[PDB]
Amino acid sequence: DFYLPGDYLLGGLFSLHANPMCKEYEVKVIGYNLMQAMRFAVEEINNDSSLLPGVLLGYEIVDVCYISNNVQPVLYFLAHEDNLLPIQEDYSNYISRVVAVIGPDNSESVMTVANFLSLFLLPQITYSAISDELRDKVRFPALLRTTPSADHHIEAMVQLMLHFRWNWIIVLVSSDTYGRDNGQLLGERVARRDICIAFQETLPTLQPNQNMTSEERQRLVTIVDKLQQSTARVVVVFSPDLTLYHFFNEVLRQNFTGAVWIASESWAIDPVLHNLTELRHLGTFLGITIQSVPIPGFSEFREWGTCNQECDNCLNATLSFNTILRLSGERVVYSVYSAVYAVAHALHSLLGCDKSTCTKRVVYPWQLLEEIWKVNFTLLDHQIFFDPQGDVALHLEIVQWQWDRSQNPFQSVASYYPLQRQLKNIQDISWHTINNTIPMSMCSKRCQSGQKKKPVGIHVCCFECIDCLPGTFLNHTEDEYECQACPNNEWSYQSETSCFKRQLVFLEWHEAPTIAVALLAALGFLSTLAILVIFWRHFQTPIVRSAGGPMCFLMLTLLLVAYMVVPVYVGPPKVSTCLCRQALFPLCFTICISCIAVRSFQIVCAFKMASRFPRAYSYWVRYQGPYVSMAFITVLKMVIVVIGMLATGLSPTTRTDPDDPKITIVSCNPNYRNSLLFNTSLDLLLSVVGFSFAYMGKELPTNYNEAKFITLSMTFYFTSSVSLCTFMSAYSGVLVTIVDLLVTVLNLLAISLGYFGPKCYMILFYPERNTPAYFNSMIQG
Amino acid sequence: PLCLSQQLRMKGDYVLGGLFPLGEAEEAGLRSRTRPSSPVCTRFSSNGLLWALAMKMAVEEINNKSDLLPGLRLGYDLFDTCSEPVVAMKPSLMFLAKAGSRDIAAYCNYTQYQPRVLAVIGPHSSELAMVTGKFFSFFLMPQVSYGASMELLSARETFPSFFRTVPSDRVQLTAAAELLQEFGWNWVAALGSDDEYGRQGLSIFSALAAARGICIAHEGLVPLPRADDSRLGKVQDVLHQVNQSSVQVVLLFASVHAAHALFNYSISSRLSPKVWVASEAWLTSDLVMGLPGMAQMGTVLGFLQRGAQLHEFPQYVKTHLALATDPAFCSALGEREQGLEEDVVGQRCPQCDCITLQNVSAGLNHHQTFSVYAAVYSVAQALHNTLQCNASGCPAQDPVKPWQLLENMYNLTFHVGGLPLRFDSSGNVDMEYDLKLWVWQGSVPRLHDVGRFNGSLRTERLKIRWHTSDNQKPVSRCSRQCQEGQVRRVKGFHSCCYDCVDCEAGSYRQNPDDIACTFCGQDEWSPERSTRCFRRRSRFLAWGEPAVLLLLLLLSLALGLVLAALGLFVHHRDSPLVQASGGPLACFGLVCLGLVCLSVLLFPGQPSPARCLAQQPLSHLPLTGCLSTLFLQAAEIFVESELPLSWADRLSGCLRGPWAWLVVLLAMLVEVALCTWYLVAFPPEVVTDWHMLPTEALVHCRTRSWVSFGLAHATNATLAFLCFLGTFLVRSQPGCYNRARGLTFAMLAYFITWVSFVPLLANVQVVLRPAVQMGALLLCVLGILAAFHLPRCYLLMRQPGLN
């Protein structure tokens, strides 16, 4: 069970026990299983006549004892039958007693043996070691391998992680070199693949024989409590099963229910951990192993019953766990069996056998290495060829840990092709979710439409979701990370990753208030036209003339402009209509008010004040003091207009209506409120001063009645201005322009139908007042 | 040709072994392994030969010395390592073959084994250290290394025969962690070389971070300079993390090349300066001292080994090279060493030995030599003790086997150059360290001492410049054991430490463990840093509000004056003046003042939506009726003032009787009509806002549009304005107080009040909006009496008195 003579032997280094004498160590069923696998491989090769006619192969296994018995195995190998190994510079002339050694399973022991073998350049196929260092060939020329590297395992792991959408993971790696190396590899693999580790922390070693030392006890308590505190519920673990036993025991005692534990090869499949059969309450356990077509006739071989070369009770443990092994269908046995067959095929080609008779040429080790580096052969419908870096294209496979003792303790979920570097054929997988769903494991829920995502913590996976304010829309189209503004008429609101529209609003002619005021102004303008027609029709009277004579028409003429301007208020508040309303309408309004004000001023002066300063008022009237005064008023208003234009913006402003963005008031000026106040305060002052003077001269002339009209106009304009003030102070958002047009007509009518209209009214009702004699008597009195 | 290879062995009695890099294997054979042959190492190295000469000096010293190993001389088996296990393992296998043979047996037992050398002066490179130590451990041959520093080599289950000097990376890493702990630097991001050195140091430092307390922030590796050049890109990412983690301290356990690449990129990218806790592999190497601009990259400070330099070494090296030039001595030693292993030593060529004294006379004062020197003494002393020798000879009964040393090499005390070194159980001596800085003065970083390390740090922060400004120590701390109120976002590469964030206003925390400031309903009120949602208090137009109380008092005053006036009106019925002021229409007006009091009085207290609906319209109602009475009087006065004669008489006749009351009730009807109209259009309702102010829930009579109320009031206001136009023009009565002027003050003040308080009402805050509204009607109604009826009373209580 450990030796077989032959012509060209095949050394073996199976690890029989774990945790010189080495049967005191804990027995490992897998070690003897793999030993029997290699035995079956060599036996089948020798039985066959096609593979190698005659030229009997030979084997010999020396237990490696995990890490303890590494040097002695190889030294006994590559040594003469008398156990003397000479030292030479050139070893091309050395006949090592074993052509090629197999067996080193632990990566560290694999390196330890491979150093010496590279010294002698002995072929060495490692059947289970995984560390990526062995990929390097400058360090290990003769370290062929028939199981994929750890990088392929980690890629399968991360592709499984992606397929179920878990970007928030946790990593637990033992202290030994294996754990740290696999952890670094997973970190570098996931830092690029959208997945962010919640936290990677070391798992202290706990041997089964260990008495669970205290410091380790509270360290592990820290580990588990941090685990359950966090939100990542996919826990990838890289550690030998020996420590996993204690770790899982303690965590199970700790009530950590929701968790998806990913296992590494080291313990992805192993009878020791499977036999616990009490982990159904910790969720689902996944791992990665290597799948291959089952050896056709190896289980029947199994069931059949140098230092530390032999073992004590390996067969008893194998018989105990035979049910699991047969149901589980051990597959690393294929790894070692294919390694033995690759060595056999290399020895076959090297001997150049003609398929019927072989020349038993003395074979050097390095020659077999050169020939084995290129074997290309079928094996149970699996192609065996080594890539230039010493590795075979052997299908990995995701293993779901099924507790049910019915059959198949290990379940095949996903198949991972290394040549394509892709994990696929993911069959149905049951979980720990109550509905048999895919367990969630994410750092933060994806933000709903309309909110930006701003990162939280160092990791780029998760963020806080914030509904970016109105006018800013989630730019998921280009940059989903940060929300972006939505300028111009486009306007967004809370959330709403898509903007809305702003409608500019101005003064139209359809709104019922607009129609009503337009009709009011049309009636007023028709009244003004009738007043003008009567005035021109009765210029012979002293009522028409004393209102200004021909110059009175000018007021009326200028008055016409305002009515013409009245619609000019309606229409888009573009630069043109704006400049019109800002330059000429104030001109009319002002001259219209001020000429009447000066009329009253001089009427009362000739009545009352002129006597106070007779010479002064006479010299003033020399150049038409009244006409001089309101000429200066026209000049002052021109000054106000130009100053307002200089200090104020002609162009309109589409100021957002506070009621809703979709309505935006196109105010003809940025601050037409205060600008209008500055323009019309002078009008108010002039009107009130004229009213006060008329009130002083309230002794209205019998035929002139200047008070009865002028005072009405002035008081009602004062009230109108205050009404406009109140409406602004309320600031009815919409309709400001239409009410302003209402008010413009309001004061226009104030002047027109408060002063001029009554003149025509009395002219038509009775002409006696127009009698020149009565007019002169009234002037005197 | 210099005589070196001949000197690279000596016979002695208990031959030592050497595994040094006297050469550097060319970078072809290492890659070209198709034939089983070790690559040659023709390329010469200086430090390797210096170390070999140091071993030679130590051996010659012990042999010459009398009290140490009397009568027993020690030899050499100087063999090259070429910094490559493939070519360094053949000499190792040679060291353990057999006494004077070339075959290494594979017997199960090693107790009966008799190797050729007694011990090995272990290699320098730690990969070589691991490989050769794994090989030597089984055969229990004491291997003392002079340059190995990886911590695994101290694992005395797989390396039981390793007795390195040059303490491991563990000790300097503990020194760095202790420095961080005593400088309060929990939040530290530790980098490492991609090679095994960096990863090993990083793992040890993770364990030390867990133990001491400092919380790792970013645990990455910096790739070595390689032909891929994607390394450079990767560095940026690693470097980027240092920027992102917000760390002022970074542990760089990188080798000289890796740290060189890191710092070159850091300068080239304008990286923010920070403390750079260094390592012995780069803290002094010139390849990182030469980089331009490095002075502006924070304070570089790290622990460097302390140990007496092997003085009197330069003279010995110069003398030995010169004597190796001398033909006589070379020929003599060649004759002495004939047919033996004097040729199998490394660099055995002529040219392999033919060099110039300047070829090696550069690192003559190299700190590694002492280690090599120390190593020999160690084994010397070890041997001196395992033979139980004393001063002036010793029995030396049987050739001592190496495992005898193994037994009698642990916890050994030997003095090297006056330094009493001593191994520990793990086999590594404990030498102290000193904190070397990188103070810059002229772009030539000078390193100076800050504090020493005897296993416990003795720093003194005062000396370190700390760059930054005002030599402020860069604080890189992590919020640990923070205030419970904040929300706790766990950070760090390990779960260690966390960021604490004060919660926002309006959002509470369900439990301390949860990681979100939960947002509760507006019914509760949540200020900053409150894990709870606190209910507010109702805020309304209560009868007890100070403004509301003042308004109630004003209403009481108004009621009193109204009752006084109406008592005078009920009494003075016969007097023509009372009637001429309005008659029983003015009685309707005075009771309408009382009724507008009875109307406006619905505002204060707990408001109901129904109260909002039914309050303001019936509020305008009685005031509207009384003001309609006022309008009757004013219009009659205006018609009297006009002079149409016939029209005045007709209007007086029409208005004296039926039309007066008809118009009064028509005004009442119009008021109720527009009341119903607005109630259909914009009926105000009681609504509650909780976000208007934080600590209270503002329940108040929200108005759908104050424009509707404005128009409802404006009905009576426009009647007021019509009578105002009718009455203002009237000139004062000749020799008598004018009647029209009473109405004139009345309505003019009424406008001055309402036109005024509409904007004042709009400006004021929402809940007082009804409050001042109260006052409005009060002031409003007050106005009338203060400007309409006060003269009426004045006369009535003075009309009898005047006459």
Do the chains contact at A92 and B108, CB–CB below 8 Å?
Answer: no
**End residue of a domain, out of B422, B457, B481:** B422
Integer angstrom CA distances of residue B230 from A117, B196, B237, B242: 33, 20, 11, 19
* Minimum distance, in Å, between the CA of residue A300 and any CA atom of chain B: 34
CATH number reported for the structural domain that contains residue B92 in this entry: 3.40.50.2300
- Answer yes or no: are the C-beta atoms of A318 and A298 closer than 8 Å: no
Whether A399 contacts A286, CB under 8 Å: yes
Which of B376, B393, B422 marks a domain boundary? B422
Q: Measured between CB atoms, which of A89, A116, A202 is closest to B89?
A: A116
* DSSP three-state, residue A749: helix
| Cβ separation A698–B731 shorter than 8 A | yes
Same domain, B697 and B556: yes
Spell out which residues of chain A touch residue B491, defining contact as CB-CB under 8 Å. 457-458
Q: Do B493 and A200 touch (CB under 8 A)?
A: yes
- Domain boundary pick from B381, B400, B422: B422
Burial of A647 (0-12, 13-18, 19+ CB in 10 A): exposed
Q: Domain end: A366, A385, A404, which one?
A: A385
Domain of B81, in residue numbers: 6-167+310-422
Backbone angles phi, psi at B512, to 5 degrees: -60, -35
Strand segments (E) across A334-395: 376-378, 383-385
CATH classification at residue B774: 1.20.1070
Mapped onto helix, strand or coil, the DSSP state of residue B514 is coil
Length in residues, chain B: 803
> Are A458 and B218 a contacting pair at CB < 8 A?
yes
The dihedral through the CA atoms of B706, B712, B714, B716 has a sign that is negative
Q: Please judge whether A229 and B495 are an interchain contact, meaning their C-beta atoms are less than 8 angstroms apart.
A: yes
Burial class, A456, CB count within 10 angstroms (exposed 0-12 / middle 13-18 / buried 19+): middle
Q: Which of A323, A336, A240, A346 is nearest to A290 (CA)?
A: A336
Taking CA atoms, what residue in B is nearest to A698?
Answer: B731
B77 to chain A, closest Cα gap in Å: 15
The verdict on residue A112 lying in a domain is: yes
Q: Which residues of A touch B94 (CB under 8 A)?
A: 87
Whether residue A340 contacts residue A38, with contact meaning beta carbons closer than 8 Å, is answered with yes
Residue B540 lies in a domain: no
Chain B CB contacts of A121 under 8 Å are 33, 35-36
DSSP of A613-625, one letter per residue? SHHHHHHHHHTTH
Question: Which residues, 6+ apart, have CB-to-CB distance to A446 below 8 Å?
Answer: none
Pairing of strands B413-416, B249-253: unpaired
Q: Is B374 helix (H, G, I), strand (E, B) or coil?
A: helix
Amino acid in the structure at residue A481: Y
- Asked if B495 and A201 come within 8 Å (Cβ–Cβ), the reply is yes
Min Cα distance A249 → chain B (Å) is 22
Is the four-CA dihedral A601, A607, A612, A616 of positive or negative sign? positive
Residues with Cβ within 8 Å of residue B71, at least 6 apart in sequence? B393, B394, B396
Q: Which residues of B touch A75 (CB under 8 A)?
A: 104, 106
Please name the amino acid found at residue B307: G
- The reply to whether B190 falls in a domain is no
Best CA proximity match to A318, nearest among A3, A30, A63: A30
Domain that holds residue A672: 512-780
- Token pair of A763 as six digits: 């002219």
In this structure, is residue A459 part of a structural domain?
A: no
Q: Is the dihedral of CA B64, B69, B73, B77 positive or negative?
A: negative
Same domain, residue pair A523 and A672: yes
Residue of A nearest to B91 (CA): A87
Containing B575, the helix (H) or strand (E) segment is none
Burial of B111-139, coded b for 16+ CB within 10 Å and e otherwise, reads eebebbbbbbbbbbbbbbbbbbbbbbbbb
Burial classification of residue A290, based on how many CB atoms lie within 10 Å of its CB (0-12 exposed, 13-18 middle, 19 or more buried): buried
**Residue found by looking up tokens 């829930």 in the block:** B697
List, as one string, the DSSP characters of B193-208.
BSSHHHHHHHHHHHHH
User: Which chain B residues are closer than 8 Å to A92 by Cβ?
Assistant: 35-37
Torsion angle in degrees (nearest 10) through CA of B59, B64, B69, B72:
90
Q: Domain for residue B690, yes or no?
A: yes
Sequence-separated (6 or more) residues with CB below 8 Å from residue B500? B479, B482, B483, B486, B487, B488, B489
Name the residue in chain B with its Cα closest to that of A197.
B493
Tokens of B124: 């320098």
Q: Tell me: do B551 and B407 sit in the same domain.
A: no
Range A713-739 burial, b when 16+ CB lie within 10 A, else e: bbbbbbbbbebbbbbbbbeeeebbbbb
Handedness of CA A511, A512, A516, A522 (dihedral sign): positive
Q: Do B203 and A202 touch (CB under 8 A)?
A: yes
* Sign of the alpha-carbon torsion through A156, A157, A162, A164: positive
Query: Cβ separation of B729 and A698 shorter than 8 Å?
Result: yes
Interface test with A, best of B27, B31, B86 (most A CBs within 10 A): B86
Strand duo A124-125 + A98-102: pairing: parallel
Residue A411 maps to a domain? no
In a domain, A72, yes or no: yes
Residue A180 is nearest to which of B94, B107, B203, comparing CB atoms?
B203
Q: Which of B88, B119, B117, B115 is nearest to B104 (CA)?
A: B115
| Pick from A633, A624, A587, A619: nearest CA to A602 | A624
Chain B residues whose beta carbon lies within 8 Å of the beta carbon of residue A712: 725, 729
**Taking CB atoms and an 8 Å cutoff, what residues of chain B touch A388?**
none
Whether residues B556 and B414 fall in one domain? no
- Compute the distance between CA of residue B258 and CA of residue B219 in angstroms, rounded to an integer: 16
Start-to-end CA span in chain B (Å): 157
Report which DSSP code applies to A282. Answer: G
How many other CB atoms sit within 10 Å of the CB of residue A321? 18
Answer yes or no: do B104 and A85 touch at CB < 8 A. Answer: yes
Q: Do B729 and A732 touch (CB under 8 A)?
A: no
Asked whether residue A257 is domain-assigned, the answer is no
Same domain, A375 and A518: no
For residue A379, tell me if it sits in a domain.
yes
Could you give the dihedral angle defined by the CA atoms of residues B538, B539, B545 and B548, in that order, rounded to the nearest 10 degrees? -130
- DSSP class of A606: I
**CA B326 to each of CA A7, B60, B320, B321, B337: distance values in angstroms, whole numbers, following the listed order:** 57, 19, 10, 9, 17
First to last CA, chain A: 153
List the single residue in B with minimal CA-CA distance to A729: B759
Nearest CB among B86, B495, B513 relative to A119 is that of B86
How far, in Å, CA of A541 to CA of A532, rounded? 14
Nearest CA in chain A to B732: A698
Both structure tokens of A723: 């009404």
B531, B509 Cβ separation under 8 angstroms = yes
Residue B703 domain-assigned (yes or no): yes
Which residues lie below 8 Å from residue A519, measured CB to CB, with a gap of 6+? none
B80: part of which helix (H) or strand (E)? strand B78-80
Are B134 and A730 an interchain contact pair (Cβ–Cβ within 8 Å)? Answer: no
* CA of B38 vs chain A CAs: smallest distance (Å): 7
Give chain A's radius of gyration (CA, Å). 53
In a domain, B182, yes or no: no
Give residues with Cβ within 8 angstroms of A90, minimum separation 6: B35, B36, B37
Q: Among candidates A760, A727, A743, A446, which has minimal Cα distance to A569? A: A743
**Whole-number Å distance between alpha carbons of A580 and A568:** 8
For residue A456, the distance in angstroms to the closest alpha carbon of chain B comes to: 8
Domain membership of residue A743 (yes or no) is: yes
Give the number of other CB atoms < 10 A from CB of residue A121: 26
Closest CA in chain B for residue A93: B36
Domain with residue A323: its CATH number is 3.40.50.2300
A204 to chain B: nearest residue by CA? Answer: B207
**C-alpha Rg value of chain B to the nearest Å:** 54
Residues B418 and B550 in one domain: no
Number of structural domains (chain A) is 2
Tokens 């179920």 appear where? Answer: A164
The answer to whether residue B210 sits within a structural domain is no
Q: Are strands B275-277 and B300-305 parallel, antiparallel or unpaired?
A: parallel
Judge whether B595 lies within some domain.
Answer: yes
| A115 to chain B, closest Cα gap in Å | 7
Please tell me whether residues B411 and B557 are part of one structural domain.
no
Mutate: best of A64, A107, A120, A184, partner B, most B CBs <10 A: A184
Distance from CA of A328 to the nearest CA of B (A): 34
- Say if A165 falls within a structural domain: no
Residues B418 and B551 in one domain: no
- Which of A369, A385, A401 marks a domain boundary? A385
Tell me how far apart the alpha carbons of residues A256 and A435 are, in angstroms, rounded to a whole number: 19
Q: How far is B641 from chain A (nearest CA, A)?
A: 12
Supply the CATH number for residue A653's domain: 1.20.1070
Query: Could A92 and B37 be called an inter-chain contact, meaning their C-beta atoms sit closer than 8 Å?
Result: yes
**Domain count within chain B:** 2
Contact A370 B492 (CB under 8 A): no
Handedness of CA B703, B706, B709, B713 (dihedral sign): positive
The token pair at B655 is: 């208005």
B138·A708 Cβ contact <8 A: no
Contact between A141 and B104 using a beta-carbon 8 Å cutoff: no
- In degrees, rounded to 5, the angle at the alpha carbon of residue A223 between the alpha carbons of residues A220 and A227 is 140
**A515/B639 Cα distance (integer angstroms):** 35
In a domain, B292, yes or no: no
Final residue of a domain: which of A332, A361, A385?
A: A385
A184 neighbourhood in chain B, CB within 8 Å = 199, 221
Give the DSSP H or E segment for B275.
Answer: strand B275-277
Phi, psi of A96 (to 5 degrees): -70, 140
Torsion angles phi and psi, residue A653, rounded to 5: -120, 125
Sequence-ordered alpha helix ranges (H) in B183-245: 196-212, 230-244
Q: How far is A134 from chain B (nearest CA, A)?
A: 14
- Quote the longest CA-to-CA distance of chain B: 167
The tokens for B212 are 């001491």
Contact of A238 with A178, CB cutoff 8 Å: yes
The answer to whether B224 touches B194, Cβ cutoff 8 Å, is: yes
List the single residue in B with minimal CA-CA distance to A74: B106
Task: Give chain A's largest Cα–Cα span.
Answer: 165
Within 13 A of A181's CA, how many CA atoms are on the CB side? Answer: 19
Helix H or strand E segment including B133:
helix B126-138
Residues in chain B within 8 Å Cβ distance of A138: 30-31
Residue type for position B280: E
